Amino acid sequence: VQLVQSGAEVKKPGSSVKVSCKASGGTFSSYAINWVRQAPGQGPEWLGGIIPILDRVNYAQKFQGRVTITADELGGTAYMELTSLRSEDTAMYYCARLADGPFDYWGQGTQVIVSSNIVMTQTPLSLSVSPGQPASISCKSSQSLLHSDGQTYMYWYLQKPGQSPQLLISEVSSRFSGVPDRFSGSGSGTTFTLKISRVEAEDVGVYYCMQAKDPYSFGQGTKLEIK
Amino acid sequence: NIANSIDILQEKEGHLDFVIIPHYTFLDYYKHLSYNSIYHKSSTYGKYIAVDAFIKKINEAYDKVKSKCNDIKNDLIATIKKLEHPFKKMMDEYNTKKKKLIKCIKNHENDFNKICMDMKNYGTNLFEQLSCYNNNFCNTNGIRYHYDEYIHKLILSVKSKNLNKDLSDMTNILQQSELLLTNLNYIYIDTIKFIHKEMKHIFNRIEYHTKIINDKTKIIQDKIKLNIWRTFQKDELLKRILDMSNEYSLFITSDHLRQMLYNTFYSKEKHLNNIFHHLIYVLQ
């Protein structure tokens, strides 16, 4: 499936914005759609999510009262309404089917310009390497990502320039399909590491760690650039 | 007794197929059981290539046993074609050729049972290999992947149709044939009587399968909501995988048969309308 969002907006402070998310196939079957925003100087921020088949919504505590997430009953369209807009709300807003086994996909993003329990600490903030040089990125969580089910809900995303974030590694070390063997994940509990044995030009972008132990929170980001 | 649970399909003129309903349900059950068991963990998800290839191999083996009844099946088609294109000898001929097809199916029952048991042993082995890291917190991700992939679109398809209105349209067609037959006071009357009798039996099987579809569509919709985005104890997860596999198999069997019978009904209705045309316009 592919997710298609509504167009760019410029809003005044105090107004509302409603963003749509359409599934190409016409349904969200039995899975979840989550809303994630990204402000100019910050890492991704989870707003909330919906499981349309259950009519179950989950909101981030800092957005409760201001965010309303809804879904079309038989139309395959999800919505996110953010009210009482402030200049802090200027961000790229995305809908996504987040890190669900072999399924991870995102909308193209909706530019909105206004005219957490588990904290993720990413290190370093930026990395400058020549092609072929190895690269390492660390992530530390304020609480353990190990769940009673035996899974450690640690994820690594790469956002290439002019693109939506893409899943690289699931549950600490599983490479996503199409991800080259140069990427590898390791760690347990609260400390995790992403390694690139040799950097290539196509690796350029911002890497983000995402935790799903208490869905969802992200690291601030590691900008990787060449030379 | 599989002799009382066989549906006969004639989707196009000159064609005949049969479905031993308990075997269709049984093979479908172990297909859903196989996928639920492998989709449960990411380390076993990749076994879908081997499951698809095993199921394909089981279907070809089942069709190879069905092909043993082909001469008898083709002999019955020739009698139906003679009885529909214009009598006691022919009606006797039809009854004993249909009995011969059921006998042929019955004669190869262990051959079908051997193939059904291969599918059961395969589905059961994967089901027994299902494991949880903590048997108190078993994830239900496999139930969701299998439902999204094989079931969800059939539920949507069913909900987009008015199967009850289809039944109503079919009763209207049957009533019009009864009206035409009643006021006809010949060999054409005997073929109109035979075709109307086939259509009424086909309709009764459509109504039977439609009741199962309407029932299982509501049950699948309610049960999926209780078995997803949750964890279960291992024994509870296993019981709910068998429960869903059962619900899906009963739904898919009836859905597939109702569509095949719907096609059979309108193929015979098209032929009956041509007989009505030749009798009214080209004859009297």
Author numbering:
A (entry chain B): 2 to 116, 132 to 243
B (entry chain A): 156 to 241, 300 to 398, 404 to 502
What text comes from the article?
Blood-stage vaccine development was bolstered by the identification of a well-conserved complex used by P. falciparum merozoites to invade host erythrocytes. This complex was initially found to be composed of reticulocyte-binding protein homolog 5 (RH5), cysteine-rich protective antigen (CyRPA), and RH5-interacting protein (RIPR). RH5 plays an indispensable role in mediating merozoite invasion by binding the erythrocyte surface protein basigin. RH5 is not constitutively expressed on the merozoite surface but is sequestered within intracellular organelles and is only released to the surface just prior to engagement of basigin, providing a limited time window for antibodies to bind.
However, MAD8–151 and MAD8–502, isolated from two malaria-exposed Malian individuals, were among the most potent neutralizers out of 186 antibodies from both cohorts and targeted the same epitopes as the most potent vaccine-induced antibodies. To enable crystallization, we prepared scFvs for the naturally acquired antibodies MAD8–502 and MAD8–151 and crystallized complexes of each scFv bound to RH5. As expected from epitope binning, MAD8-502 bound to a site on the top half of RH5, with an epitope consisting of helices 4 and 6 and the loops joining helices 3–4 and 6–7. This site overlaps with the binding site for R5.004, with MAD8-502 binding to RH5 with a very similar angle of approach and sharing a large number of contact residues.26 In contrast, MAD8–151 bound to an epitope on the opposite face of the top of RH5, formed from the anti-parallel helices 2 and 3. MAD8–502 used the same VH gene (IGHV1–69), targeted the same epitope (bin I), and had similar potency to vaccine-derived MAD10–466. Aligning the structures of these vaccine-derived antibodies to their naturally acquired counterparts reveals that each pair bind to RH5 with very similar poses. In the case of the MAD8–502 and MAD10–466 pair, binding similarity is predominantly within their heavy chains, where interactions made by CDRs H1 and H2 to RH5 are conserved. These CDRs are encoded by the IGHV1-69 gene, which the mAbs share, and utilize a conserved hydrophobic patch in CDR H2 (residues I52, I54, and F/L55) to bind RH5. Indeed, MAD10–466 binds more intimately with RH5 than MAD8–502, with the light chain variable domain rotated slightly toward RH5, enabling CDRs L1 to L3 to make contacts. Meanwhile, only CDR L1 from the light chain of MAD8–502 interacts with RH5.
